[PDB]
Amino acid sequence: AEFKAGSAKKGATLFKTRCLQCHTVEKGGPHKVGPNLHGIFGRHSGQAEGYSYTDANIKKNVLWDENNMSEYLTNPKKYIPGTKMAFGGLKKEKDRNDLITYLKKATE
Ligand code: HEC
Numbered sequence: 001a002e003f004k005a006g007s008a009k010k011g012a013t014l015f016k017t018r019c020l021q022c023h024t025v026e027k028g029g030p031h032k033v034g035p036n037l038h039g040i041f042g043r044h045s046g047q048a049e050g051y052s053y054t055d056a057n058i059k060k061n062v063l064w065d066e067n068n069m070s071e072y073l074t075n076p077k078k079y080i081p082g083t084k085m086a087f088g089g090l091k092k093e094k095d096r097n098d099l100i101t102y103l104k105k106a107t108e
């Protein structure tokens with residue numbers, strides 16, 4: 001994937017309607033179904049403390065960045081076979097861009 005900066009505000013609404021049910025983003029926000037995502041960019045997958053990950057997510061051992069995030073969110077289970085993240089994917093490129101733009105800022 002090739003991330004391009006988009007709308008953080010549209011990204012916030014996307015995140016809040018599609019991800020918030022399972023994830024928080026703020027520093028010190030709780031793990032829910034999925035892990036809190038603060039600091040996710042520039043951290044390896046499966047390394048948020050206090051969250052019980054699948055072996056598949058840990059073994060993937062991907063250094064999260066803007067580009068591999070876009071790929072992941074397109075089809076999570078395709079990028080990380082075995083993941084328990086039950087999200088079909090964001091198929092529109094503009095949506096992933098908007099979401100990732102938000103995500104970069106919100107996870108600081
Ligand atoms: C539950 C119904 C979820 C929804 C909706 C979304 N996510 Fe998720 N995500 C969920 C789980 C259970 C997990 C852990 C998967 C595992 O196999 O252990 C995840 C994982 C992620 C990750 C990776 C986190 C890491 O520390 O490596 C990211 C980056 C992530 N999820 C982001 C994300 C976004 C942006 C969502 C909506 C667009 C989203 N998730 C939805 C559970 C669920």
Ligand code: NA
Pocket residue numbers: none
């Ligand atoms: Na709860």
